[PDB]
Amino acid sequence: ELSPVALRQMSCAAGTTQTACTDDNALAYYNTTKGGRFVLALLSDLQDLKWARFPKSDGTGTIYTELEPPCRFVTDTPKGPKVKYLYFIKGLNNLNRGMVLGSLAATVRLQ
Amino acid sequence: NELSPVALRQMSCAAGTTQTACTDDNALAYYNTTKGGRFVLALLSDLQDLKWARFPKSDGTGTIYTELEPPCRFVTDTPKGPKVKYLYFIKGLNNLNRGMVLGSLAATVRLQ
DSSP states (O other): OOOOOOOEEEEEEEESSTTTOOSEEEEEEEEEOSSSEEEEEEEESOSOOOEEEEEOTTSSOEEEEEBOOOEEEEEOOTTSOEEEEEEEBTTOOHHHHHHHHHHHHHHSOBO | OBOOOOOOEEEEEEEESSSTTOOSOOEEEEEEEOSSSEEEEEEEESOSOOOEEEEEOTTSSOEEEEEBOOOEEEEEEETTEEEEEEEEEBTTOOHHHHHHHHHHHHHHSOBO
């Protein structure tokens, strides 16, 4: 059926270009199925990101994914509201967009 | 531009195999608090044969019955041990809202 699979988070590199992916500057929401991680969305403080870099665990190589235009949103932080940017993977369907938003509501102090 | 952020609220509710069979709180409803009215997305229940959910109207006028999709079965890890649960989407729920419920569940519950 549509059995729910756990959405996990991990830090990851992202940048304006693929070469620009420098050091961990974002947080990736991903799925773990079969052999490999399925990244659904990026979470970051930066608003001009276009790419995300992911090294597979086996070290065979690294994966670059195009990012959609970011969805700006606000989180509640002890030091006051903070503005974050939510990047869906390019071409992400609405079902997986929903799962991201559902997981984001649970792992982040929204509004 | 700005993203629409909604928190999935949960509330105990009545359910049954028929509209008349809806009496006690047999399930918990995932809903959204909108400007006015509660928008129910899905039902979570120990029972696997549910078809309707009942919500007495806030205005006191009557009761609302929303029909259920076929249940999705899954196992949660609880202190009492693994518990078989059944997830019912509201009849006709779009894919975004379905993902919202599926994303909230897997982010807040341990699955087997």
